[PDB]
Enzyme design. Structure first.
Site, PDB file in Angstrom:
ATOM      1  N   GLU A 291      28.399  12.855  19.074  1.00  0.00           N
ATOM      2  CA  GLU A 291      28.475  13.119  17.645  1.00  0.00           C
ATOM      3  C   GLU A 291      29.213  11.985  16.955  1.00  0.00           C
ATOM      4  OE1 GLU A 291      29.465  17.113  16.075  1.00  0.00           O
ATOM      5  OE2 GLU A 291      31.174  16.154  15.091  1.00  0.00           O
TER       6      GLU A 291
ATOM      7  N   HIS B 102      25.306  18.715  10.146  1.00  0.00           N
ATOM      8  CA  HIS B 102      26.078  19.431   9.144  1.00  0.00           C
ATOM      9  C   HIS B 102      26.349  18.527   7.947  1.00  0.00           C
ATOM     10  CE1 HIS B 102      26.861  22.227  12.495  1.00  0.00           C
ATOM     11  NE2 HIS B 102      27.090  21.131  13.195  1.00  0.00           N
TER      12      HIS B 102
ATOM     13  N   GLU C 242      29.746  15.811  22.733  1.00  0.00           N
ATOM     14  CA  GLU C 242      29.406  17.125  22.218  1.00  0.00           C
ATOM     15  C   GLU C 242      29.310  18.126  23.370  1.00  0.00           C
ATOM     16  OE1 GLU C 242      29.662  17.109  19.108  1.00  0.00           O
ATOM     17  OE2 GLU C 242      29.243  19.221  18.693  1.00  0.00           O
TER      18      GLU C 242
ATOM     19  N   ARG D 128      25.444  24.262   7.735  1.00  0.00           N
ATOM     20  CA  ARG D 128      25.221  24.007   9.151  1.00  0.00           C
ATOM     21  C   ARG D 128      23.773  24.206   9.582  1.00  0.00           C
ATOM     22  NH1 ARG D 128      27.692  26.559  12.909  1.00  0.00           N
ATOM     23  NH2 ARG D 128      29.274  25.146  13.770  1.00  0.00           N
TER      24      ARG D 128
ATOM     25  N   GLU E  82      30.577  23.038   3.959  1.00  0.00           N
ATOM     26  CA  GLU E  82      29.758  22.575   5.071  1.00  0.00           C
ATOM     27  C   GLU E  82      28.571  23.512   5.246  1.00  0.00           C
ATOM     28  OE1 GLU E  82      31.266  23.020   9.164  1.00  0.00           O
ATOM     29  OE2 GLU E  82      30.631  20.948   9.496  1.00  0.00           O
TER      30      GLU E  82
ATOM     31  N   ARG F 265      33.729  30.536  12.486  1.00  0.00           N
ATOM     32  CA  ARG F 265      33.148  29.234  12.778  1.00  0.00           C
ATOM     33  C   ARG F 265      31.636  29.279  12.957  1.00  0.00           C
ATOM     34  NH1 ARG F 265      36.091  28.693  16.595  1.00  0.00           N
ATOM     35  NH2 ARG F 265      34.498  29.184  18.161  1.00  0.00           N
TER      36      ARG F 265
ATOM     37  N   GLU G 240      27.647  14.942   9.696  1.00  0.00           N
ATOM     38  CA  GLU G 240      27.988  14.845  11.111  1.00  0.00           C
ATOM     39  C   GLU G 240      26.684  14.769  11.894  1.00  0.00           C
ATOM     40  OE1 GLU G 240      30.250  18.333  11.917  1.00  0.00           O
ATOM     41  OE2 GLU G 240      31.860  17.838  10.512  1.00  0.00           O
TER      42      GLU G 240
ATOM     43  N   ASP H  29       0.841  -1.190   0.000  1.00  0.00           N
ATOM     44  CA  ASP H  29       0.000   0.000   0.000  1.00  0.00           C
ATOM     45  C   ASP H  29       0.880   1.244   0.000  1.00  0.00           C
ATOM     46  OD1 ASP H  29      -1.935   1.943   0.274  1.00  0.00           O
ATOM     47  OD2 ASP H  29      -2.348   1.501   2.381  1.00  0.00           O
TER      48      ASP H  29
ATOM     49  N   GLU I 200      24.418  14.226  15.285  1.00  0.00           N
ATOM     50  CA  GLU I 200      24.451  14.446  16.721  1.00  0.00           C
ATOM     51  C   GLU I 200      23.160  13.936  17.342  1.00  0.00           C
ATOM     52  OE1 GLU I 200      24.912  18.657  16.995  1.00  0.00           O
ATOM     53  OE2 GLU I 200      27.025  18.616  16.406  1.00  0.00           O
TER      54      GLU I 200
END
Lengths: 436, 436, 436
Positions: free
Chosen positions: B188, B237, B181, B327, B325, B308, B124, B53, B126
């Site tokens: 992580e 990320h 973390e 985020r 990357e 960062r 990555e 289904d 977490e």
């Protein structure tokens, strides 16, 4: 392997060290009845049969065991292996007892064979998995909050589910697929599309096998048509097909819908007669708590191909796999009576060339009462009393089931409804105690 | 080893005694769906496929198994081994179903191949590790008060974490690193680069593997974007890179930043279009309790090389390891849809020569509203309703995802937000009951 | 193997390492009495007998062991095997003791042999299965809510029931069938035909074997004639037949009902004399709580062939299986005295050619008092006091049982009734405290 003769059964018992043999049969109301027999008594039982009380069904009855139904239960006590067996019920004078639902199904099968047809049924059974209290009594505590087809549960209940699946596979059930259902802690198991009699016997075995496994693993399996309010109920859809000369008769490659005229007549007969044995397909009060608008349960008499809410749904599969699905029954029903009545209604529809009418491709629940009246769409009985009233005046059901079963079923259901109708529920107290 | 043909799968099943095969697929909203199949049915399933289904995804479609995705789950029940498998969804007429997120990702990959690129993604992931109550229900009780990269936990939870890591390694996941973390009881896990389709399948398997291990060891693994207030949330990320002719497109030794013009166009396209599918990258209401100023979660649209806290960050690694990357996404997102939209947006940016503008090397949070207005720094949607409103008018998102998925996703999210917006939370009672 | 001589018993004890021998005998009131003997004492006991106290039955007596009654109990302690044995009671002067119920049954058998008849009895024993409290004391909590012939229980109580059945088969009981009974947690076990003495000994052993198994598995097995109000009680029906020259006396192929005139005289004698030893067949007060209108228990003196609610029922089986079933007794009765009185009544009926009258084929409970008075349907004692009063003036019972047993039984029952009649029950307080 497959056991055919009683010598094979005796050899299997001796080889695998089966200590106890349990008979298996069901009463009129669908409860599973059984009693145990020592292994040494098996040869004498095969030779002469076993006397027992017919009051369990409906008073001395003789049971003649059927070697072809022998099977070993999927648990291994330290004492020894356990196996079950079925048979036919005979009156002391030698005539078969007409009150046995299995006899009713066999008569329906003979009636179908008179016209050359045979039925194959694959059902879809749904059940819940609740927790047990400290005293081991059943409860309604949920085990997970998963959804449709979810990969749940993942705790020990996952191991319980896997054990249930493996135990079912160990007996040769040949399960099609098992998955989570819409309601939390609800699961569905699809049976292999096969012969109707073996299917009914397998369903009867399945119920208590699953219940026993659930107990022994510390949980509870329930087959109530609606154990919780606000969630979907448990139903038992019945895929079916008719075969003549080894070929499916529902499949017609020359038609736009790939369906033969016989399928149309079968659907017409089912639609015509479903109201009369709705009581059989839904035998308890709770079944009509399940049949309410707003869920997957159908409450209107219609057939469709693409729509899912229709009472009778035709899957897109064609060819040898062509089938017709009836979505009214629930697991609490007696499989023998339900299948026999469904077959008889379909055969009567085919014989009389009943036209099923135009399909309903729209959502019936979204339509208004005036629209339904204009389209002439009928509805299933609202409560058990209405279903009983509809069944009482049906001569077709009386002819199909016989006088004894008809009368006993009506009396039992009437007494149950009379007992239920006089109770004061806590909902009434909550709504009315302070207001009035 | 690696299984490529159905004969290899059958040989592996026979050799290692696999009793059950579980299909695997995800619906539009990212929930993992699955159902079980007995090992004997596997050959017939390979030959003809399995009917099921499609209401679970979005009404009957056929699933054709892919032998290349066969793998064995990392737990050994006493009954026998368990393995999973994936496949493609086809309509009864034979055309592929366009509502499958896997099909959306495959179409995105096909477009990238049309322009001659292939994408490698290493995410990555977490998650939290909470305690279970006496009844086995998930809770939010912490297991340790460790910090970033701390050597914690050291109690039996350490054994649970090591078991999770070993189980993941036993499946051939090829983990890079795993660490504690910032938030207490937050961990992580990092993946290696690989084909985007394989990465998405690995993530989908990862989620329920980790959850099952957590249950079986007595704990709970949670993937909520923000389960606790005052601590950092969980994000996913997505490092990505475009490969053409076997070499990294992004890497350019002649530029001062060692980044090619194609990378600049990719970043420009992502910055231009991220606001529209922010709803896809953050699907649930709780995701926007994480996107608030004051934590590692980004709330302003900018890209940088050394900062960062930017939405798009360029790691200092160069050569074949050059990557971008993003985020914004969180583990609750659907990997297929998120990756497909990300790749399509990057490809459109490359095609249209979109300039990403000057990077932001300062702390945006420390700036003022006037400064942000002067620099033209846009911000992500504040709540799920705003994200839905932005997504609804996006022609590009509808074109990428197709009409069916677009409409169904919008309807589901709208219903969820409407249900959420009418609730009275205990915070309101604590704040206003005494004051008013 | 069938043990005949004392040498066989000694060889079996040495071979199977039996460490303890337990004597077995019953008092006048039906309680089971026993004492232990070390294995080394067995040879001396066989040579000279064992002295003991006769006050336990009714004062120094001598027991002469019977090697033909040697059996090994169905449990294996780590110390060694345990066995039981029976014997005859002799006075110090050497004359047999006339107060032993076994001696009463032997005298009845000899009286039957005087006319060349022998009796076979197969009883149907019914019992309950309750839960133990935290202190291991018997209580009355149900274990299942099954019905007649239901396939229940399915929890560990199923294993307990299977263990009971296996132990019974292991001792060599040759059980016919075992099944659930009408009341919840009620079960029934049926025996094969055999000589009345062996059947009585088997029943006496059965009671304590089942009780011991129930304790050792954590449950309680009760033989109370009516432990719960509103449900069926427990009875011990007695199927009996007389054999002359190796052929069944009752079966007569020439008669329309296939019953001989001797059977008619037997039934007539039983109907005539049942009133006088109803007290023996129902020894405790609770038995007359069981004997109330509205259940399976019979309360009127009548015999029938098709109606199954009569006091005496004739099963449809014929040939060597021809039998007569008496449905008054309950498991609390003493089997020796009950069987002896049944035999004496039947033989006295045969001697005097007592006509049993016309059978009652209608429902007696549905008739009026005037109707039953016209039909002359007499009734069983309503309470233990009435039964004692009837038994006191019975010359036949006194001469059948002997002066000693008659007087002791009457005195004990009179004392018990006098103690009971002066108690104030909580029901009286509930009904009368507020009203008066």
């Amino acid at each position: 392997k497959k056991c055919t003769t009683k010598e094979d059964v005796l050899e299997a018992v001796k080889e695998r060290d089966v200590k106890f043999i349990r008979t298996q049969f069901t009463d009129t109301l669908g409860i599973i009845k059984s009693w145990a027999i020592p292994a040494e008594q098996l040869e004498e039982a095969f030779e002469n049969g076993v006397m027992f009380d017919g009051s369990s069904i409906q008073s001395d009855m003789k049971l003649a065991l059927d070697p072809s139904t022998f099977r070993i239960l999927p648990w291994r006590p330290a004492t020894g292996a356990v196996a079950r067996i079925l048979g036919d019920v005979y009156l002391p004078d030698g005539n078969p007892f007409k009150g046995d639902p299995r006899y009713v199904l066999k008569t329906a099968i003979k009636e179908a064979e008179k016209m050359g047809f045979s039925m194959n049924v694959g059902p879809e059974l749904e059940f819940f998995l609740f927790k047990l209290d400290a005293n081991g009594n059943p409860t309604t505590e949920l085990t997970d909050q998963g959804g449709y087809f979810d990969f749940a549960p993942l705790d020990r209940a996952q191991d319980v589910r896997r054990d249930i699946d493996y135990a079912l596979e160990h007996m040769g059930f040949q399960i099609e697929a098992s998955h989570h259902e819409v309601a939390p802690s609800q699961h569905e198991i699809d049976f292999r599309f096969g012969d109707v009699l073996c299917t009914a016997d397998n369903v009867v075995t399945f119920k208590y096998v699953v219940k026993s496994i659930a107990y022994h693993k510390g949980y509870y399996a329930s087959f109530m048509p609606k154990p919780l309010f606000g969630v979907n109920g448990s139903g038992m859809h019945s895929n079916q097909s008719l075969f003549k000369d080894g070929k499916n008769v529902f499949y017609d490659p020359d038609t736009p819908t790939k369906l033969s005229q016989d399928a149309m007549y079968y659907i017409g007969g089912l639609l015509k007669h479903i109201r009369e044995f709705t009581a059989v397909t839904n035998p308890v009060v709770n079944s009509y708590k399940r049949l309410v608008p707003g869920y997957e349960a159908p409450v209107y008499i219609s057939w469709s191909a693409q729509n899912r809410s229709s009472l009778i749904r035709i899957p897109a599969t064609r060819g040898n796999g062509t089938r017709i699905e009836l979505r009214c029954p629930d697991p609490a029903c007696n499989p023998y009576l339900a299948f026999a009545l469904m077959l008889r209604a379909g055969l009567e529809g085919i014989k009389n060339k009943i036209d099923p009418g135009e399909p309903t491709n729209v959502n019936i629940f979204h339509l208004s009462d005036k629209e339904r009246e204009e389209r002439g769409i009928r509805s299933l009985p609202a409560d058990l009393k209405e279903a009983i009233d509809e069944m009482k005046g049906s001569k077709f059901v009386k002819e199909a089931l016989g006088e004894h079963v008809f009368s006993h079923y009506l009396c039992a259901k009437e007494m149950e409804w009379d007992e239920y109708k006089a109770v004061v529920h806590p909902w009434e107290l909550s709504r009315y105690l302070s207001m009035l």
